[PDB]
Design a protein around this ligand. Structure first.
Ligand SMILES: O=C(O)CNC(=O)C(=O)O
Ligand SMILES: [Mg+2]
Ligand code: NI
Ligand SMILES: [Zn+2]
Length: 331
């Protein structure tokens, strides 16, 4: 069995190996990468996402989100308070302001310590989930706006043609902006490219151990757990590495830098934070191996999780018994 300890693996594809996306995902899996829940892919030196980032300041962040925490330093929830629209250039200035800028630090480890110690006492503003792409149309390899669609994958594997579309999203981050513990919608894969700026630290639980994290989360957020049998789908709960280690939950950590891809695998729980001003692009995707995870994915039916148009067909086709309840939660 490859990668039996479920370590995060890092890949350095050649330019030739970077041509066929599906093939390379399958190669990584042949080496056990999925066991970790997360892999890093460093693109060949010949590759570029686009020529420059000099012209991105006019992009609009229509609904910047201020991430307000409640709880204790290692165990908290966050809610998103909507703020007035601002451009990327306005957001970058805000991120770099004394109120929001990254503090002096020695190295990633020192910054990580500062994050866990101090995150709850601040409310950073995140430009998340902005439909769009920063890949040049002429970038043919690993261009997140030109991947095979999940609807086409389900059609190819199962024979059923469905409605829906699959497009990427931009994330503009600052110091302490946070992504809560989650798996993807319908336990899909995700791929994330860090276009520019400061790093992003990830934490991940191996898919084979995801239920351990769920059980801890029910313990730690007991009101939330009573409200919803899949409340991690709400994407509001944080648990620190220290707390995870105290409770024996298997996990790993890695820092992604600008110019690097991360792939999250089906049912790989992940969480993390941004080091300073940055811009990432991410999209969900599927492979044949995903279908079995999609059929077994938990779902939130309490109303909170509220998701894209395109999840309807996945639930309807893969989870017909759950569909009527889930759709009531949509409505
Ligand atoms: O970058 C972020 O804020 C969150 N990204 C992901 O959860 C992802 O790419 O799957
Ligand atoms: Mg612009
Ligand atoms: Ni994710
Ligand atoms: Zn719910």
């Amino acid at each position: 069995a490859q990668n039996p300890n479920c370590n995060i693996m890092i890949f350095h594809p050649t330019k030739e190996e970077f041509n066929d996306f599906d093939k390379y995902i399958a190669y990584m899996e042949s080496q056990g990468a999925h066991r970790a829940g997360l892999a890093k892919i460093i693109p060949p030196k010949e590759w570029k996402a686009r020529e420059t980032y000099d012209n991105i300041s006019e992009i609009l962040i229509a609904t910047p989100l201020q991430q307000v925490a409640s709880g204790r330093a290692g165990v908290f929830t966050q809610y998103h308070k909507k703020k007035k629209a601002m451009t990327v250039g306005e957001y970058r200035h805000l991120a770099n302001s004394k109120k929001y800028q990254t503090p002096p630090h020695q190295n990633f480890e020192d910054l990580e310590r500062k994050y866990w110690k101090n995150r709850i006492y601040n409310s950073p503003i995140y430009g998340a989930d902005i439909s769009g792409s920063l890949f040049d149309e002429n970038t043919k390899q690993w261009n997140l706006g030109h991947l095979g669609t999940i609807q086409d994958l389900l059609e190819k594997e199962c024979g059923v043609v469905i409605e829906g579309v699959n497009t990427p999203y931009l994330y503009f981050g600052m110091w302490k902006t946070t992504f809560a513990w989650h798996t993807e919608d319908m336990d899909l894969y995700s791929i994330n490219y860090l276009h520019l700026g400061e790093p992003k630290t990830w934490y991940v639980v191996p898919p084979e151990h995801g239920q351990r994290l769920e059980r801890l989360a029910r313990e730690l957020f007991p009101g939330s757990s009573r409200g919803c049998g899949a409340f991690l789908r709400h994407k509001v709960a944080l648990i620190s590495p220290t707390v995870l280690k105290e409770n024996g939950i298997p996990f790993n950590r890695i820092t992604q830098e600008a110019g690097e891809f991360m792939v999250t695998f089906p049912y790989g729980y992940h969480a993390g934070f941004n080091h300073g001003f940055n811009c990432a692009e991410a999209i969900n995707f599927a492979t044949p191996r995903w279908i079995d995870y999609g059929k077994m994915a938990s779902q939130c039916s309490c109303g909170e999780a509220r998701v894209t148009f395109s999840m309807d067909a996945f639930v309807r086709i893969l989870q017909p018994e759950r569909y009527d309840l889930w759709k009531r939660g949509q409505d």
